[PDB]
Amino acid sequence: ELRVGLEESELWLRFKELTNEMIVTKNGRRMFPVLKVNVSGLDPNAMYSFLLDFVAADNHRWKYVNGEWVPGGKPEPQAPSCVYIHPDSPNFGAHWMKAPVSFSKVKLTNKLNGGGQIMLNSLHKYEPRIHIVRVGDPQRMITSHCFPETQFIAVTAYQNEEITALKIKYN
Numbered sequence: 001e002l003r004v005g006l007e008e009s010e011l012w013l014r015f016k017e018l019t020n021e022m023i024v025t026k027n028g029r030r031m032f033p034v035l036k037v038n039v040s041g042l043d044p045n046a047m048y049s050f051l052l053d054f055v056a057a058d059n060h061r062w063k064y065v066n067g068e069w070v071p072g073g074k075p076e077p078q079a080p081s082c083v084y085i086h087p088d089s090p091n092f093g094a095h096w097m098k099a100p101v102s103f104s105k106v107k108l109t110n111k112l113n114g115g116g117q118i119m120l121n122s123l124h125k126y127e128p129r130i131h132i133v134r135v136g137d138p139q140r141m142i143t144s145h146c147f148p149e150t151q152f153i154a155v156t157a158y159q160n161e162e163i164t165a166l167k168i169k170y171n
Ligand SMILES: O=C(c1ccco1)N1CCN(C(=O)C2CC2)CC1
Pocket: 003, 004, 005, 006, 007, 009
């Protein structure tokens, strides 16, 4: 059976309990924690590409008020479709399953200024989603897993000083 497990789930849950934040910048900022998954039940012989996108979680934006995240108004129009191709793509099942798949180089941005970046709306909540695309498949089979532990609010600057401190502690 195909199984995609979140790595460092305990670390992600430490951030999620505070409400996770990821910085977005003009030039793009790498994530901490880094999304990493373990994979079993691929065809070791088949070739696959790994894609990453970010799904908008809510029909509203968020605001940090009195040390609490609360609904902060109507959402901006959805960020454009941005898919990140894992740089090991395409590769054998055996490649993806032999060691955890790390999305260490993906950059989150609030400006479409190129460079394979992911455009996100500040003060909106997103949930990372990984797609496994089988290569040379006339049916273009794709599997999609969501990672609820990895939900975060995109921010131009950290709102919660406990998040700022956590990011420094574990990174
Ligand atoms: O789908 C399965 C699974 C396990 C047994 C039968 O199916 N898993 C395990 C739980 N997962 C995690 O990411 C763990 C929290 C870290 C996702 C993958």
